[PDB]
Ligand binder design. Structure first.
Ligand SMILES: Nc1nc2c(ncn2[C@H]2C[C@H](O)[C@@H](COP(=O)(O)OP(=O)(O)OP(=O)(O)O)O2)c(=O)[nH]1
Ligand SMILES: [Mn+2]
Ligand SMILES: [Mn+2]
Ligand SMILES: [Mn+2]
Ligand SMILES: [Mn+2]
Ligand SMILES: [Mn+2]
Ligand SMILES: [Mn+2]
Ligand SMILES: [Mn+2]
Ligand code: NA
Length: 325
DNA sequence: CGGCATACG
DNA sequence: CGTAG
DNA sequence: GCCG
Protein backbone atom coordinates (compact mmCIF):
# COMPACT_ATOMS: atom_id res chain seq x y z
CA UNK A 1 0.00 0.00 0.00
CA UNK A 2 1.65 3.26 -1.13
CA UNK A 3 1.71 6.19 1.25
CA UNK A 4 0.07 8.87 -0.93
CA UNK A 5 -3.57 8.58 -1.96
CA UNK A 6 -2.75 9.59 -5.55
CA UNK A 7 -0.69 6.40 -5.91
CA UNK A 8 -3.57 3.97 -5.47
CA UNK A 9 -7.09 3.55 -6.85
CA UNK A 10 -9.85 4.52 -4.46
CA UNK A 11 -13.36 3.54 -5.57
CA UNK A 12 -16.50 5.30 -4.44
CA UNK A 13 -17.86 2.22 -2.69
CA UNK A 14 -15.61 -0.17 -0.81
CA UNK A 15 -15.26 -2.85 1.86
CA UNK A 16 -14.53 -0.87 5.04
CA UNK A 17 -17.31 1.72 5.13
CA UNK A 18 -17.94 1.65 8.89
CA UNK A 19 -14.27 1.89 9.81
CA UNK A 20 -13.62 4.74 7.40
CA UNK A 21 -16.69 6.67 8.60
CA UNK A 22 -15.49 6.46 12.21
CA UNK A 23 -12.04 7.79 11.39
CA UNK A 24 -13.62 10.59 9.34
CA UNK A 25 -15.64 11.68 12.39
CA UNK A 26 -12.38 12.10 14.28
CA UNK A 27 -10.87 13.96 11.34
CA UNK A 28 -13.83 16.35 11.19
CA UNK A 29 -13.66 16.97 14.95
CA UNK A 30 -9.95 17.71 14.67
CA UNK A 31 -10.71 20.32 12.03
CA UNK A 32 -13.26 21.97 14.28
CA UNK A 33 -10.48 22.35 16.86
CA UNK A 34 -7.98 23.71 14.34
CA UNK A 35 -5.74 20.61 14.38
CA UNK A 36 -5.06 20.32 10.66
CA UNK A 37 -2.28 17.78 11.14
CA UNK A 38 -4.50 15.36 13.05
CA UNK A 39 -7.30 15.95 10.53
CA UNK A 40 -4.97 14.93 7.72
CA UNK A 41 -3.75 11.76 9.43
CA UNK A 42 -7.29 10.59 10.22
CA UNK A 43 -8.45 11.43 6.68
CA UNK A 44 -5.47 9.57 5.19
CA UNK A 45 -6.03 6.55 7.45
CA UNK A 46 -9.68 6.45 6.43
CA UNK A 47 -8.67 6.67 2.78
CA UNK A 48 -6.24 3.74 3.12
CA UNK A 49 -9.14 1.56 4.24
CA UNK A 50 -11.23 2.69 1.27
CA UNK A 51 -8.46 1.41 -1.00
CA UNK A 52 -8.20 -2.06 0.51
CA UNK A 53 -9.52 -5.00 -1.53
CA UNK A 54 -11.57 -6.62 1.26
CA UNK A 55 -12.79 -5.99 4.83
CA UNK A 56 -10.41 -5.56 7.73
CA UNK A 57 -11.46 -8.24 10.23
CA UNK A 58 -8.42 -8.44 12.54
CA UNK A 59 -5.97 -5.92 13.94
CA UNK A 60 -3.14 -7.90 12.33
CA UNK A 61 -4.28 -6.62 8.96
CA UNK A 62 -3.33 -3.04 9.85
CA UNK A 63 0.35 -3.84 10.36
CA UNK A 64 2.43 -2.08 7.76
CA UNK A 65 -0.46 0.02 6.40
CA UNK A 66 0.56 3.67 6.09
CA UNK A 67 -1.01 6.24 8.44
CA UNK A 68 -2.01 3.61 11.04
CA UNK A 69 -0.35 4.26 14.36
CA UNK A 70 -1.40 3.82 17.96
CA UNK A 71 -4.44 6.09 17.77
CA UNK A 72 -6.07 5.02 14.50
CA UNK A 73 -5.30 1.37 15.22
CA UNK A 74 -7.01 1.59 18.61
CA UNK A 75 -10.11 3.08 16.96
CA UNK A 76 -10.24 0.14 14.55
CA UNK A 77 -9.57 -2.35 17.36
CA UNK A 78 -12.52 -1.04 19.36
CA UNK A 79 -14.84 -1.16 16.37
CA UNK A 80 -13.76 -4.73 15.55
CA UNK A 81 -14.13 -5.89 19.18
CA UNK A 82 -17.23 -4.00 20.36
CA UNK A 83 -18.85 -2.51 17.26
CA UNK A 84 -18.37 1.04 18.57
CA UNK A 85 -15.45 3.25 19.56
CA UNK A 86 -16.08 5.21 22.74
CA UNK A 87 -14.10 8.24 21.58
CA UNK A 88 -16.04 8.43 18.34
CA UNK A 89 -19.38 8.17 20.15
CA UNK A 90 -18.34 10.84 22.64
CA UNK A 91 -17.52 13.16 19.74
CA UNK A 92 -20.78 12.39 17.94
CA UNK A 93 -22.97 13.27 20.90
CA UNK A 94 -20.98 16.33 21.97
CA UNK A 95 -22.60 19.75 21.88
CA UNK A 96 -19.39 21.22 20.44
CA UNK A 97 -19.20 18.77 17.55
CA UNK A 98 -22.92 18.92 16.72
CA UNK A 99 -23.02 22.72 16.76
CA UNK A 100 -19.78 23.22 14.84
CA UNK A 101 -21.05 20.79 12.20
CA UNK A 102 -24.37 22.62 11.93
CA UNK A 103 -22.77 26.07 11.75
CA UNK A 104 -19.98 25.21 9.28
CA UNK A 105 -22.55 23.58 6.98
CA UNK A 106 -23.96 27.05 6.42
CA UNK A 107 -22.77 28.62 3.17
CA UNK A 108 -20.79 31.65 4.30
CA UNK A 109 -19.74 30.21 7.68
CA UNK A 110 -16.36 28.56 8.20
CA UNK A 111 -14.67 27.01 11.21
CA UNK A 112 -13.46 30.37 12.52
CA UNK A 113 -16.90 32.01 12.39
CA UNK A 114 -18.63 28.90 13.78
CA UNK A 115 -16.16 28.73 16.67
CA UNK A 116 -16.68 32.38 17.58
CA UNK A 117 -20.47 31.98 17.55
CA UNK A 118 -20.09 28.84 19.68
CA UNK A 119 -17.99 30.70 22.24
CA UNK A 120 -20.64 33.46 22.27
CA UNK A 121 -23.20 30.86 23.35
CA UNK A 122 -25.00 30.42 20.04
CA UNK A 123 -26.24 26.91 19.32
CA UNK A 124 -29.06 26.82 16.71
CA UNK A 125 -29.98 28.29 13.34
CA UNK A 126 -32.79 30.25 15.00
CA UNK A 127 -30.19 31.71 17.37
CA UNK A 128 -28.51 33.11 14.27
CA UNK A 129 -31.74 34.31 12.68
CA UNK A 130 -32.51 36.24 15.89
CA UNK A 131 -29.46 38.50 15.38
CA UNK A 132 -29.39 39.02 11.61
CA UNK A 133 -27.40 42.27 11.81
CA UNK A 134 -24.12 40.43 12.48
CA UNK A 135 -24.51 38.29 9.33
CA UNK A 136 -23.01 38.83 5.92
CA UNK A 137 -25.15 38.79 2.80
CA UNK A 138 -23.59 35.44 1.97
CA UNK A 139 -24.47 34.08 5.41
CA UNK A 140 -28.03 35.42 5.16
CA UNK A 141 -28.42 33.55 1.85
CA UNK A 142 -26.90 30.41 3.34
CA UNK A 143 -29.26 30.60 6.31
CA UNK A 144 -32.40 31.36 4.27
CA UNK A 145 -31.68 28.42 1.96
CA UNK A 146 -30.15 26.08 4.55
CA UNK A 147 -33.05 23.61 4.54
CA UNK A 148 -33.03 23.17 0.75
CA UNK A 149 -29.23 23.03 0.73
CA UNK A 150 -29.50 20.08 3.17
CA UNK A 151 -31.52 18.04 0.68
CA UNK A 152 -29.29 15.80 -1.45
CA UNK A 153 -28.82 16.83 -5.06
CA UNK A 154 -29.70 13.90 -7.33
CA UNK A 155 -28.46 12.93 -10.79
CA UNK A 156 -31.74 14.07 -12.38
CA UNK A 157 -31.14 17.47 -10.84
CA UNK A 158 -27.66 17.53 -12.39
CA UNK A 159 -28.89 16.84 -15.93
CA UNK A 160 -31.44 19.66 -15.69
CA UNK A 161 -28.91 22.17 -14.34
CA UNK A 162 -26.37 21.30 -17.05
CA UNK A 163 -28.82 22.12 -19.84
CA UNK A 164 -29.69 25.55 -18.41
CA UNK A 165 -26.01 26.39 -17.84
CA UNK A 166 -25.27 25.36 -21.44
CA UNK A 167 -28.05 27.60 -22.80
CA UNK A 168 -26.65 30.63 -21.00
CA UNK A 169 -23.04 29.73 -21.91
CA UNK A 170 -24.08 29.38 -25.57
CA UNK A 171 -25.48 32.94 -25.76
CA UNK A 172 -22.62 34.29 -23.70
CA UNK A 173 -20.06 32.77 -26.08
CA UNK A 174 -20.89 30.48 -28.99
CA UNK A 175 -18.64 27.44 -28.99
CA UNK A 176 -17.94 27.44 -25.25
CA UNK A 177 -18.35 24.10 -23.50
CA UNK A 178 -19.61 22.94 -20.11
CA UNK A 179 -18.07 19.94 -18.32
CA UNK A 180 -19.51 18.34 -15.16
CA UNK A 181 -16.83 18.09 -12.48
CA UNK A 182 -16.66 17.41 -8.74
CA UNK A 183 -18.20 14.40 -7.11
CA UNK A 184 -20.68 13.68 -9.88
CA UNK A 185 -17.78 13.23 -12.32
CA UNK A 186 -16.30 10.69 -9.85
CA UNK A 187 -19.55 8.68 -10.06
CA UNK A 188 -21.50 9.91 -7.05
CA UNK A 189 -25.25 9.46 -7.26
CA UNK A 190 -25.92 12.30 -4.82
CA UNK A 191 -24.12 15.40 -3.71
CA UNK A 192 -24.56 18.63 -1.88
CA UNK A 193 -23.77 20.81 -4.90
CA UNK A 194 -23.03 20.59 -8.63
CA UNK A 195 -19.66 21.66 -10.07
CA UNK A 196 -19.12 22.78 -13.69
CA UNK A 197 -16.04 23.79 -15.67
CA UNK A 198 -16.42 26.05 -18.71
CA UNK A 199 -13.87 26.71 -21.49
CA UNK A 200 -13.65 27.58 -25.20
CA UNK A 201 -11.44 25.85 -27.80
CA UNK A 202 -9.85 29.16 -28.93
CA UNK A 203 -7.32 30.34 -26.31
CA UNK A 204 -8.32 33.74 -24.94
CA UNK A 205 -11.93 33.68 -26.07
CA UNK A 206 -12.98 32.67 -22.54
CA UNK A 207 -11.81 36.03 -21.13
CA UNK A 208 -14.74 37.88 -19.55
CA UNK A 209 -17.06 34.91 -19.97
CA UNK A 210 -18.31 34.29 -16.44
CA UNK A 211 -19.96 37.72 -15.92
CA UNK A 212 -21.78 37.23 -19.21
CA UNK A 213 -22.99 33.78 -18.14
CA UNK A 214 -24.13 34.99 -14.73
CA UNK A 215 -26.04 37.96 -16.12
CA UNK A 216 -27.90 35.68 -18.50
CA UNK A 217 -28.75 33.16 -15.80
CA UNK A 218 -29.91 35.98 -13.54
CA UNK A 219 -32.12 37.47 -16.25
CA UNK A 220 -33.76 34.03 -16.62
CA UNK A 221 -34.73 34.14 -12.92
CA UNK A 222 -32.55 31.16 -12.02
CA UNK A 223 -30.09 32.77 -9.61
CA UNK A 224 -31.20 33.07 -6.02
CA UNK A 225 -27.70 34.18 -4.89
CA UNK A 226 -24.33 35.02 -6.38
CA UNK A 227 -21.50 37.37 -5.45
CA UNK A 228 -13.97 36.78 -12.17
CA UNK A 229 -13.37 33.04 -12.88
CA UNK A 230 -15.16 31.15 -10.05
CA UNK A 231 -18.81 31.74 -9.12
CA UNK A 232 -20.37 30.12 -6.03
CA UNK A 233 -24.08 30.29 -6.75
CA UNK A 234 -27.45 29.23 -5.37
CA UNK A 235 -29.70 28.25 -8.29
CA UNK A 236 -33.46 27.98 -8.40
CA UNK A 237 -34.13 24.47 -9.75
CA UNK A 238 -37.67 23.37 -10.77
CA UNK A 239 -39.45 20.60 -8.85
CA UNK A 240 -42.96 19.09 -9.13
CA UNK A 241 -45.19 22.15 -8.87
CA UNK A 242 -42.46 24.17 -7.17
CA UNK A 243 -38.66 24.39 -6.94
CA UNK A 244 -35.69 24.02 -4.63
CA UNK A 245 -32.48 25.93 -4.04
CA UNK A 246 -29.31 24.14 -5.19
CA UNK A 247 -25.68 25.14 -4.77
CA UNK A 248 -23.83 25.31 -8.11
CA UNK A 249 -20.17 26.21 -8.71
CA UNK A 250 -19.22 27.63 -12.12
CA UNK A 251 -15.56 27.86 -13.07
CA UNK A 252 -13.90 29.18 -16.25
CA UNK A 253 -10.45 28.21 -17.51
CA UNK A 254 -8.57 28.82 -20.75
CA UNK A 255 -8.19 25.72 -22.86
CA UNK A 256 -4.42 25.64 -22.18
CA UNK A 257 -5.20 25.20 -18.46
CA UNK A 258 -8.30 23.04 -18.86
CA UNK A 259 -6.61 19.70 -18.01
CA UNK A 260 -5.23 21.16 -14.78
CA UNK A 261 -8.55 22.73 -13.89
CA UNK A 262 -10.46 19.55 -14.72
CA UNK A 263 -8.08 17.54 -12.56
CA UNK A 264 -8.27 19.98 -9.65
CA UNK A 265 -12.05 20.40 -9.74
CA UNK A 266 -12.76 16.68 -10.07
CA UNK A 267 -11.21 15.94 -6.69
CA UNK A 268 -11.64 14.41 -4.30
CA UNK A 269 -10.38 17.14 -2.01
CA UNK A 270 -8.03 14.69 -0.25
CA UNK A 271 -6.91 13.26 -3.59
CA UNK A 272 -5.90 16.74 -4.79
CA UNK A 273 -4.10 17.67 -1.54
CA UNK A 274 -2.20 14.37 -1.77
CA UNK A 275 -1.43 14.86 -5.47
CA UNK A 276 -0.04 18.36 -4.86
CA UNK A 277 1.91 17.09 -1.85
CA UNK A 278 3.37 14.26 -3.93
CA UNK A 279 4.23 16.58 -6.78
CA UNK A 280 6.19 18.96 -4.58
CA UNK A 281 7.79 16.58 -2.08
CA UNK A 282 8.54 13.62 -4.36
CA UNK A 283 9.02 15.27 -7.78
CA UNK A 284 10.01 18.86 -6.95
CA UNK A 285 7.17 20.24 -9.09
CA UNK A 286 4.47 22.70 -8.03
CA UNK A 287 0.92 21.79 -9.03
CA UNK A 288 -2.24 23.89 -8.95
CA UNK A 289 -5.42 24.17 -11.01
CA UNK A 290 -3.66 26.39 -13.56
CA UNK A 291 -0.54 24.36 -14.31
CA UNK A 292 2.49 22.37 -13.20
CA UNK A 293 5.69 24.33 -12.64
CA UNK A 294 9.30 23.18 -12.55
CA UNK A 295 10.97 25.72 -10.23
CA UNK A 296 14.50 24.73 -11.27
CA UNK A 297 14.05 25.23 -15.02
CA UNK A 298 11.40 27.93 -14.39
CA UNK A 299 9.02 26.35 -16.91
CA UNK A 300 5.39 25.21 -17.05
CA UNK A 301 4.44 21.81 -18.38
CA UNK A 302 2.01 21.79 -21.26
CA UNK A 303 -0.80 19.33 -20.88
CA UNK A 304 -3.46 18.34 -23.35
CA UNK A 305 -5.16 15.82 -21.04
CA UNK A 306 -5.34 14.56 -17.48
CA UNK A 307 -3.40 11.56 -18.76
CA UNK A 308 -0.52 13.91 -19.62
CA UNK A 309 -0.45 15.26 -16.07
CA UNK A 310 -0.27 11.82 -14.44
CA UNK A 311 2.53 10.92 -16.88
CA UNK A 312 4.46 14.12 -16.06
CA UNK A 313 4.29 13.16 -12.36
CA UNK A 314 5.30 9.52 -12.90
CA UNK A 315 1.96 8.17 -11.63
CA UNK A 316 -0.24 5.54 -13.17
CA UNK A 317 -3.39 7.09 -14.55
CA UNK A 318 -6.52 6.97 -12.37
CA UNK A 319 -9.90 7.71 -13.95
CA UNK A 320 -12.20 9.99 -11.92
CA UNK A 321 -14.11 7.10 -10.39
CA UNK A 322 -10.83 5.89 -8.79
CA UNK A 323 -10.03 9.29 -7.23
CA UNK A 324 -12.51 8.93 -4.35
CA UNK A 325 -9.79 9.24 -1.71
C1' DC B 1 12.00 17.66 14.54
C1' DG B 2 9.08 20.06 10.40
C1' DG B 3 5.49 19.35 7.45
C1' DC B 4 0.96 18.79 6.46
C1' DA B 5 -2.41 21.91 -1.17
C1' DT B 6 -2.96 25.73 -3.22
C1' DA B 7 -5.60 28.51 -5.07
C1' DC B 8 -9.74 32.59 -6.01
C1' DG B 9 -14.01 35.96 -4.19
C1' DC C 1 -12.80 36.24 6.49
C1' DG C 2 -15.39 33.24 2.94
C1' DT C 3 -15.22 29.67 -1.04
C1' DA C 4 -13.37 25.25 -4.12
C1' DG C 5 -11.73 20.45 -5.45
C1' DG D 1 -1.41 11.88 14.20
C1' DC D 2 1.66 10.16 11.61
C1' DC D 3 5.80 10.09 8.21
C1' DG D 4 10.37 10.58 6.74
N1 LIG E 1 -27.04 22.78 4.41
C1 LIG E 1 -26.42 21.58 4.46
N2 LIG E 1 -25.21 21.45 3.93
C2 LIG E 1 -24.77 20.17 4.07
C3 LIG E 1 -25.37 19.09 4.66
N3 LIG E 1 -24.56 17.96 4.59
C4 LIG E 1 -23.49 18.38 3.96
N4 LIG E 1 -23.56 19.71 3.63
C5 LIG E 1 -22.56 20.50 2.93
C6 LIG E 1 -21.29 20.70 3.74
C7 LIG E 1 -20.16 20.55 2.73
O1 LIG E 1 -19.63 21.83 2.38
C8 LIG E 1 -20.80 19.90 1.52
C9 LIG E 1 -20.32 18.52 1.14
O2 LIG E 1 -20.91 18.21 -0.12
P1 LIG E 1 -20.55 16.84 -0.91
O3 LIG E 1 -20.43 15.69 0.09
O4 LIG E 1 -21.48 16.70 -2.11
O5 LIG E 1 -19.05 17.13 -1.38
P2 LIG E 1 -18.32 18.37 -2.08
O6 LIG E 1 -19.28 18.94 -3.11
O7 LIG E 1 -17.75 19.24 -1.00
O8 LIG E 1 -17.07 17.82 -2.90
P3 LIG E 1 -17.15 16.93 -4.19
O9 LIG E 1 -17.78 17.75 -5.33
O10 LIG E 1 -17.94 15.62 -4.05
O11 LIG E 1 -15.72 16.50 -4.36
O12 LIG E 1 -22.22 19.78 1.77
C10 LIG E 1 -26.65 19.25 5.23
O13 LIG E 1 -27.35 18.38 5.79
N5 LIG E 1 -27.10 20.56 5.08
MN1 LIG F 1 -3.70 9.62 20.67
MN1 LIG G 1 -12.18 -3.72 24.59
MN1 LIG H 1 -19.16 19.34 -5.31
MN1 LIG I 1 -18.66 22.83 -5.34
MN1 LIG J 1 -6.89 32.29 -13.16
MN1 LIG K 1 -16.77 20.98 -0.44
MN1 LIG L 1 0.15 16.63 17.21
NA1 NA M 1 -19.70 26.76 5.47
Amino acid sequence: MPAYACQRPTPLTHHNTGLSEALEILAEAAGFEGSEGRLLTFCRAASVLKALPSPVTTLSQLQGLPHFGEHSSRVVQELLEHGVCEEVERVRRSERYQTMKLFTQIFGVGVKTADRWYREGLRTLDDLREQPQKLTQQQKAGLQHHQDLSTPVLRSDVDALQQVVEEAVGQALPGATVTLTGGFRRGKLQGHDVDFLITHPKEGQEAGLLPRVMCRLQDQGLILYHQFERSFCIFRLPQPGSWKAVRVDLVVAPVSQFPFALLGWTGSKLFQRELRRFSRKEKGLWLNSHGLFDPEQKTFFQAASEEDIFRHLGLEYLPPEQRNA
